[PDB]
């Protein structure tokens, strides 16, 4: 106020003063000190035009109270800084004045929610827990107009759900089957939990393609036709966790999916422009050390299932001839080459440990033709990546290796039909033709994850032609139907043979088949517009037997 006998501005205080406390205590020429100390630190608070330093009663001050010409000025240096600090216990709380009134207790808690994990969890929880009997879980497009959820319960595969119009194009399974990818219209969805429900969603239309991190971080959305939330970015990746979309990427017309692929770890994501190969890394994906790998003309790559290893191939140019290359990352050194020279195509073919790649070379001569087809195999455990050169045959069409092994299958075209010849280990090692069968329909080459069973199969043929052999000493179990045969797959654990006939593929028959390691088939069941059937990804039979036995007895 403006009485001399004034005392300390009690309670929030007005327009134009700021008041301090703890300021510094009365005596011989400290009071003009202070003053001078004061007309250099609040100078930025305004112009001062009044200080003032009344004493409460005759009392000590502990305040001193400062007025400014223009005060916004102030209200910009106490948000400029608050705890202005000079010696000892002189630290100054800046207020026009204190509120005081309040209390600071009661703010209280939180309520956590549930997370991503929860369907990893009802997988290995699931597949324990379940009364029946015994076998793998799908993943069906096709029961009508439905998206559809099934078991193998060996009776029948019998229904859990079936979900209208749930997908509407493609649905795919995460890596260790914690989300389902589902693309509606409006944005891909990604399906988790007990009960499936939408954890998130993901602004991008015109998608066919929907595949996900091999650790389950990040999914790859792909249109091969343009819309409007592509913006001219074919190619979007999004982060799980944060929700966002993390990169797009322009189109890719070249060729068979996957044409975007990841290290085994999900570490590094990779794709080939034609003149440079082009890697991301996890978790950023951004461009790895700021570089790109340099190299012209690249056909196809696939990277090894051990720490970590891309093998790639370059065809034939008009100065260097072609060759495969086993690159190291994070290295990113070339550690293996082998130029090839006059090569038609190659094709590159890892084992499941990544133990050995092998590499099925078609040669050429000048007269531009397929004439002889080699087989040459690295050895990756062995010392310094020895080479195992094997074979020379005529027009190979099909490899493919046993499971966790060393074993593999060959198919040769143009005799008139299809010729199978089967490889086995020697004693003093090298890998080597050891069994044939006459000719036939089979086209694909497809193992059992068990490594006994290798399924010869006849894809696109209307019929048969499923052709099922039991490996070492290559014996035939079986020959059975699939009626304009199309998709394959096996039970991780090799149990169970599944068959599909796509709509996408062909319009026949449309169907699913089931089959038993044995060699007896279980079921088959035709659907009208089968679009596809993916499984999720993955002492004791005397009790299971007791278990089946009160089921249905007394």
């Not at 009365?26 to 630190?41: A, F, Q, T």
């Not at 559809?148 to 493609?170: G, H, L, M, Q």
């Not at 979007?236 to 929700?243: E, F, P, S």
């Not at 050995?356 to 990546?385: A, H, S, W």
């Amino acid at each position: 106020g403006d009485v001399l006998k004034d005392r300390p501005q009690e309670a929030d205080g007005i327009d134009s003063v700021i008041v301090v406390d703890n300021v510094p205590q009365v005596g011989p020429d400290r009071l003009e000190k202070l003053k001078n100390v004061i007309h250099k630190i609040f100078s930025k608070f305004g112009k001062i035009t009044n200080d003032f330093y009344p004493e409460e009663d005759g009392k000590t001050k502990g305040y001193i109270f400062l007025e400014y010409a223009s005060p916004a000025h102030a209200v910009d240096a106490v948000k400029n800084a608050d705890g202005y600090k000079l010696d000892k216990q002189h630290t100054f709380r800046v207020n026009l004045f204190t509120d005081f009134d309040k209390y600071m207790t009661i703010s209280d808690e939180w309520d956590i929610p549930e997370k991503q994990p929860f369907k990893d969890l009802g997988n290995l929880r699931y597949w324990l827990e379940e009364a029946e009997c015994r076998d793998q879980y799908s993943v069906i497009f096709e029961s009508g107009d439905r998206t559809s959820i099934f078991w193998n319960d060996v009776k029948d595969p019998v229904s859990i759900e079936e979900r209208a119009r749930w997908t509407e194009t493609y649905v795919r399974w995460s890596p260790k089957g914690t989300y389902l990818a589902t693309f509606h219209q409006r944005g891909i969805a990604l399906w988790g939990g007990e009960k499936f429900k939408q954890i998130q969603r993901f602004s991008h239309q015109g998608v066919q393609l929907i595949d996900f991190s091999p650790c389950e971080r990040y999914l790859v959305t792909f249109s091969p036709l343009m819309d409007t939330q592509d913006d001219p970015q074919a190619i979007i990746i999004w982060d799980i966790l944060t929700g966002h979309k993390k990169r797009g990427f322009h189109c890719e017309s070249s060729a068979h999916w996957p044409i975007f692929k990841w290290s085994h770890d999900g570490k590094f994501f990779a794709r080939m422009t034609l003149d440079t190969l082009s890697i991301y890394e996890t978790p950023s994906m951004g461009l790895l050390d700021k570089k790109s790998l340099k190299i012209s003309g690249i056909k196809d790559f696939s990277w090894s299932p051990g720490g970590n290893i891309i093998a790639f191939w370059v065809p034939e140019d008009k100065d260097i001839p072609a060759r495969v290359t086993l690159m190291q990352l994070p290295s990113r050194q070339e550690i293996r080459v082998r130029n090839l020279f006059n090569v038609v195509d190659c094709k590159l073919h890892w084992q499941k440990n990544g133990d050995y790649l092998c590499v099925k070379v078609d040669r050429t001569p000048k007269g531009t033709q397929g004439v002889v087809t080699n087989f040459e195999i690295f050895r990756m455990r062995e010392k310094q990546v020895p080479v195992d050169v094997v074979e020379m045959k005529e027009t190979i069409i099909a490899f493919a290796w046993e499971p966790n092994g060393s074993k593999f299958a060959v198919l040769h075209g143009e005799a008139p039909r299809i010729s199978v010849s089967f490889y086995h280990v020697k004693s003093n090692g090298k890998i080597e033709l050891s069994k044939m069968f006459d000719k036939q329909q089979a086209n694909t080459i497809f193992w059992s994850p068990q490594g006994q069973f290798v399924v010869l199969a006849g894809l696109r043929s209307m019929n048969g032609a499923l052709a099922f052999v039991d490996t070492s000493d290559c014996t035939v179990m079986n020959i059975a139907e699939h009626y304009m045969a199309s998709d394959v797959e096996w039970d991780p654990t090799g149990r169970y043979v599944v068959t599909s006939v796509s709509w996408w593929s062909h319009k026949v028959d449309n169907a699913y088949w089931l089959w038993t390691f044995q060699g007896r088939l279980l079921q088959k069941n035709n659907k009208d517009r089968f679009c596809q059937l993916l499984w999720r990804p993955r002492i004791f039979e005397q009790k299971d037997r007791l278990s089946q036995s009160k089921a249905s007895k007394e």
